[PDB]
Amino acid sequence: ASASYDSEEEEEGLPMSYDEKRQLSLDINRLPGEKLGRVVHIIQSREPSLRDSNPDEIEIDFETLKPTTLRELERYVKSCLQKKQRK
């Protein structure tokens, strides 16, 4: 049923691109208030350059931020999609 479910032509070896980084911008944008606060802390737990430095507002540096840290958000979102089922 996999073929009828989707196919997802997804590249794992894509070079640092703004579209690449920005794909994750749209994921964080879809996530609710509870999630944004949580994820931002997980992502920024890696980079010191994290949002900008200021922790009051949330502005994701990902244009200038590393693709390695980019993938952290990917992991999170993939987790959020399958763990949207709360208890």
Binding site: Y18, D19, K21, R22, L24, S25, I28, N29, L31, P32, G33, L36, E57, I58, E59, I60, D61, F62, E63, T64, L65
Partner: peptide, 12 residues
């Protein structure tokens, strides 16, 4: 930088 991924989660 160029195309901003600087989110600013528009919750409010």
């Amino acid at each position: 930088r160029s195309v901003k991924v600087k989110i600013k989660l528009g919750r409010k």
